[model samples]
Target: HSWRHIRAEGLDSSYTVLFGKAEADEIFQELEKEVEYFTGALARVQVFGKWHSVPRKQATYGDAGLTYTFSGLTLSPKPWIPVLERIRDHVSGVTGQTFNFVLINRYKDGSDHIGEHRDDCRELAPGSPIASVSFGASRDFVFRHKDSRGKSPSRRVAVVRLPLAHGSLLMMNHPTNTHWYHSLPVRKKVLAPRVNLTFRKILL
Candidate 1:
């Protein structure tokens, strides 16, 4: 089924696709080089708390943490590096939105992780779209409905199991951020590295 169908059915407030596997090998090689050169070593802090970071390119874009990403890293727009910018532009065309900054995450196996959280923050453009492009090893992305307890009886909340493969894109927008939370759960079986680049519009 298409993403349009998924959205219409309301299974989740997001859409995912494996974009262009035609040149899979070529894409993977280029992504490896791009990721290697940009990985950072610092951690970041947000209003919620501090996060383990791998930040890079502080001057060009804002404080975007390249290697490790934390919510606190108020990233500025970086001149789109060739490969990444291409992907960003493509997703923008697909989603009909423009993104200013990108956050890159390097998760090395089961040890690296992100906790449950929503991307609804003041730094982001309210109601704008966000695109998450996945590369390298496949990872499990989980999403679940927010607990609307006290107001209504308990209903079965839908959960989406998205195995984000190499060269895939996931689009999130609107009430999706308001009603759901997402995370990349760590798994011990994963031995290689997995990189996720999320392109967003940071309000200035």
Candidate 2:
């Protein structure tokens, strides 16, 4: 299915809920067998010229030279495995865009969460869209306006909530990353794990 618009004020973004549930399930099953999950100290980010480790864990996959850096840390992509390459091809076909890298994140039950942030990495190809596919448990994906600083309580941009269910796809366009911040907030009711793969093109 084609992408549908979700927001337009601060940015332009679109999404499709459960667009490929069956297909996603098949890919997820294959990944469960082939992909090796790991846990370690979170990524290190530079703040004020000093590096510090974050609390969340992550993994990345891509072709050679598709490195990504953000928040003071750099991530070199690992060679893509079969399941990821298949999904990347599929998403690229649907969106009519090519992708060279994917960031795979695992949320281990409800307690695992991420803070709000924009995907404005310099490595991403300019004006390229970001395609995200979610597998396993559903979670609330939230967004807030980037210009909301120091606004009157009533003038603040309303927080948006979208349920990212199994097999769902969310496509955030260029200015969307530039104008808004997004995050998957903690949901204690979600006791099962969730796997998310975000596909992108590297500038190189």
Candidate 3:
């Protein structure tokens, strides 16, 4: 249970190695075999009123009646599956965070990436702690101070990165969404697949 706390001008977060190497490998295999992605409209997001495919594949699983709305589209949740529930339970036990659903984002390789953005959505409960879990290839995650972005920005305390390794956990605690922007940058040389899950609590 190794943990690392991360704090910055408007951010309070942490990352930890949560599973044994062998246990991690086993869970990764289970997820790689059991998870499925949604296609058609459920798989795409609307930007500027135009539908487009996301760089990385996305899916959601949770309790009943828990569809998430953001980025101009609804992320419909599939009822909880066994593999996800196991991981979800462990995450909840450690963080003492309650989540009705988990969002899955799979990066088939380094080329698949996400742009900078905050997870501030109207549907999420205020000050909810989001517990993030990762498996497979290690990928780097970056956080930028919100106000420091854009041209002619302050150089002091601008950006910090936390690399996510196999079977690791990351906590994006309260107030973090208000001041930090995070991104998954492209790593062209790494070709192994990586899967990530974020356990989320939403308004009832």
Task: Give the top-scoring candidate (lDDT).
Answer: 3
Best by the TM-score measure: 3
User: 1-204, model 3: which lDDT tens digit per residue?
Assistant: 567889877899999999978999999999989888877777778777787889888888888887787677688788888999999999988888788988899999999998898988888889999898999999999998877876777665658988899999999998998888898999998799999999999775
Stretches of candidate 3 off by over 4 Å are 48-50, 154-156
Query: What are the per-residue Cα lDDT tens digits for candidate 2 across 62-177?
Result: 88877788775677788889898888887887778888898887787877887788988877788999998888889899988887745464357777788888887898887888
lDDT of 1 by residue, 81-100 (tens): 78777777788777778877
Model 3 worst lDDT window (10 residues): 149-158
- lDDT of candidates 1 onward, in order: 0.64, 0.79, 0.88
Whole-model lDDT, model 2: 0.79
lDDT of 1: 0.64
How far residue 135's Cα lies from its native spot in candidate 1, in Å, is 1.0
Model 2: residues >4 Å from true position, as ranges? 17-22, 36-42, 46-54, 149-155
- Model 1: residues with Cα > 4 Å off, grouped in runs: 4-12, 36-41, 44-77, 148-158
Clashes found in each candidate (C-alpha, N, C closer than 3 A): 6, 1, 0
